Write a protein that binds this ligand. Structure first.
Ligand code: HEM
Length: 211
């Protein structure tokens, strides 16, 4: 596994409340039974947690949405997640996502990520997008990267500026990417532990899984 995948396995284990070995085995099971990538399997597990449904129910609803709309599995899972976080129906979340996709000129997955991030941050999606675009221009990151920083703030419970501070510090101290730094910070929060412990666990899992 890559460092990204190792971190995400641990995040989704924490989100589902399973053991780490159980998360790994669920991800490989989804790969085999559905023919999806590891990343897609992890997105399925994450969306199951985001929506409070069983993995089976999340897959059923995602495949239905993906087919009805003709969108990516990734986009469908993000929309399901946004609907649950917003406390609304899938149809309502789709309407919001299509509006945003049109206004910004982004793809549906990005729009859904923005809706999810804003709901978790406790802000309107216009305010979240404004802050993300400020990060994009000032830091030279992508919109997707900026939204993950907002998501980090949302999970950690800090201002965006503070999440930026912490992620850039980790980036420089560890030589990781910005997305890796965000994800480690999220992991440490979801584990109730130090960043040092989170990093240690990600590296040990990666070694246990082959390096
Ligand atoms: C650049 C392309 C990427 C895209 C389009 C993308 C998309 C997404 C989307 C749609 C979500 C929300 C869905 C969910 O909660 O299940 C998400 C959440 C997240 N992503 Fe990404 N992502 C990308 C890269 C990465 C990378 C490289 C990492 C790690 C190194 C990462 C780590 C995370 C984490 C930790 C979450 C939050 C999970 C949680 O709730 O704790 N993402 N991403």
């Amino acid at each position: 596994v890559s460092l990204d995948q190792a971190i995400l396995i641990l995040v989704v284990a924490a989100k589902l409340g399973t053991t780490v070995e159980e998360a790994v085995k669920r991800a490989l099971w989804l790969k085999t039974k559905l023919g999806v990538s590891l990343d897609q399997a992890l997105r399925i597990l994450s969306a199951a947690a985001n929506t409070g449904t069983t993995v089976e129910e999340a897959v059923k609803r995602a495949l239905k949405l993906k087919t009805k709309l003709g969108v990516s599995l990734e986009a469908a899972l993000a929309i399901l997640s946004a609907a649950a976080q917003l406390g609304t129906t899938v149809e309502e979340a789709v309407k919001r996502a299509l509006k945003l996709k049109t206004k910004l000129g982004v793809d549906l997955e990005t729009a859904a990520l923005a809706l999810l991030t804003a709901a978790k941050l406790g802000t309107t999606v216009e305010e979240a997008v404004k802050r993300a675009l400020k990060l994009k221009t000032k830091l030279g990151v992508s919109l997707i990267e900026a939204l993950h920083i907002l998501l980090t703030a949302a999970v950690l419970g800090t201002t965006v500026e503070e999440a930026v501070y912490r992620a850039l510090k980790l980036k420089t101290k560890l030589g990781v990417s910005l997305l890796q730094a965000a994800a480690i910070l999220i992991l440490a929060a979801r584990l109730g532990t130090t960043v040092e412990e989170a990093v240690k666990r990600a590296l040990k899992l990666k070694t246990k899984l082959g390096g």
